[PDB]
Amino acid sequence: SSRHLAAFINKFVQFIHKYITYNAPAAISFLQKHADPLHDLSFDNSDLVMLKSLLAGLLTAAEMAPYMKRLSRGQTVEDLLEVLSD
Amino acid sequence: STYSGQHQRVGALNELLQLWMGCRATRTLMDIYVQCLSALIGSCPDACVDALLDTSVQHSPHFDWVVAHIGSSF
């Protein structure tokens, strides 16, 4: 049941990314200590594309322009409620 | 070189790395080449570097992502 843990998987992979970034030696030493669980999980849960990207290693602001413009220039309660709900 | 133009599958180089490492047979071949180089780095680093850069200047837009991976490792 890995699909219900999608947010957890994303958070954990980001934490692993930060671990290899800031402290590469300790992160590598941990990964080699637990290499086979990672390999087996990657083979079984191949849908974890970020995990396979890690094995290979071994935007946001633009979207919210019209929302911010509408929120800033909105006057009537309907427009404010609409943008806030969006 | 052949597949860069004859396929729809081919920032940008990051996506190229993802789609290329994603495959299985090519990934294993790249692993074999990495093992070969790790055996060769200690013995003849300059000659391997010279061969790699000659092949690069001859075939730059084709296998640079493998060179990018090797650089990331070393």
Spatial distance between the Cα atoms of B58 and B46, rounded to a whole number of angstroms: 18
**Alpha-carbon distance A31 to nearest alpha carbon in chain B (angstroms):** 15
Q: Resolution of this PDB entry, in A? A: 3.7
Spatial distance between the Cα atoms of A58 and B73, rounded to a whole number of angstroms: 8
Q: Are B19 and B8 in contact (CB under 8 A)?
A: no
Eight-state DSSP code of residue A4: G
- B16 interaction partners in chain A (CB closer than 8 Å): none
Q: Are B26 and B20 in contact (CB under 8 A)?
A: yes
- B72 interaction partners in chain A (CB closer than 8 Å): 57
- Of B35, B67, B23, nearest to A55 by C-alpha is B23
Residue A16: CB partners within 8 Å, gap ≥ 6?
A27, A54
Spatial distance between the Cα atoms of B20 and A47, rounded to a whole number of angstroms: 16
The token duo for A43 is: 């083979």
| Chain B nearest-CA residue for A48 | B22
One-letter identity of residue A73: R
Report how this structure was experimentally obtained. Answer: cryo-EM
